[PDB]
Design a protein around this ligand. Structure first.
Ligand SMILES: Nc1ncnc2c1ncn2[C@@H]1O[C@H](COP(=O)(O)OP(=O)(O)OP(=O)(O)OP(=O)(O)OP(=O)(O)OC[C@H]2O[C@@H](n3cnc4c(N)ncnc43)[C@H](O)[C@@H]2O)[C@@H](O)[C@H]1O
Length: 214
């Protein structure tokens, strides 16, 4: 099963990708996790994104498509995988198409723009794994620590109010056209398209997703 998760900044894609991965066994391929990991380890494919992500801007399609094709080539992606935050532009969606990467579901996370800033202020991460928390809406079991490793939780560098306003603008100019793109894909018969209300509680969104997927 191959799934794309499409949606605004902090719509809860990452949170739901952890559930889909543990319950359907397909690996989560998050381009922001991979890009933050590259920037941190000084990896030649990807360490260039540092200043771009910092600024709230989209990294160049040629860079991110390179990253995705290497990852998708690993033997764990043979029985499906889950794309979280990829594609992000029509170039990146075209490129998966030319490459013969067709997906089964495109799931759009709808959240109003007004909710974005307060999700940013209480988000905390386990950077080694892409586990994400919210101090109010989905807190760790012990305050400040990752549930699985007990390691200390951090804030993302780019979770500032003005960085997220820029992320939103770029989302509206470049990514949001992908809703029309895969709706058109779905009409053609190439994929299934489903919309979920991202303002619901985490457990509620999760259960909506179990309904669509099996
Ligand atoms: N393909 C690409 N092309 C180019 N550049 C790229 C790229 N990919 C990455 N980059 C770059 O890297 C940068 C960062 O992008 P990136 O990290 O890739 O962005 P994203 O995939 O859109 O996801 P976000 O991190 O914004 O949030 P999310 O929807 O996964 O929600 P989350 O579950 O964390 O949670 C949101 C918060 O609220 C929470 N929450 C989750 N669900 C709920 C709920 N039900 N109710 C309330 N709170 C909730 C969480 O606890 C958390 O605290 C980009 O700007 C760009 O520079």
């Amino acid at each position: 099963m191959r799934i794309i998760l499409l949606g605004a900044p902090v719509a809860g894609k990452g949170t739901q990708a952890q559930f889909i991965m543990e319950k359907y066994g397909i690996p989560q391929i998050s381009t922001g996790d991979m890009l933050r990991a590259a920037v941190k380890s000084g990896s030649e494919l990807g360490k260039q994104a540092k200043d771009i992500m910092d600024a709230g801007k989209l990294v160049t399609d040629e860079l991110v498509i390179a990253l995705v094709k290497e990852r998708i080539a690993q033997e764990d992606c043979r029985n499906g995988f889950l794309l979280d935050g990829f594609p992000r532009t029509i170039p990146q969606a075209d490129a998966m198409k030319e490459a013969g990467i067709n997906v089964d579901y495109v799931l759009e996370f709808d959240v109003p723009d007004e909710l974005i800033v307060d999700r940013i202020v209480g988000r905390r991460v386990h950077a080694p794994s892409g586990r994400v928390y919210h101090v109010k809406f989905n807190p760790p079991k012990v305050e400040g620590k990752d549930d699985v490793t007990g390691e200390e939780l951090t804030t993302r560098k780019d979770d500032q109010e003005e960085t997220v306003r820029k992320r939103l603008v770029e989302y509206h100019q470049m990514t949001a056209p992908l809703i029309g793109y895969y709706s058109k894909e779905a009409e053609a018969g190439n994929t299934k398209y489903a919309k979920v209300d991202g303002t619901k509680p985490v457990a509620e969104v999760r259960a909506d997703l179990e309904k669509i997927l099996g």
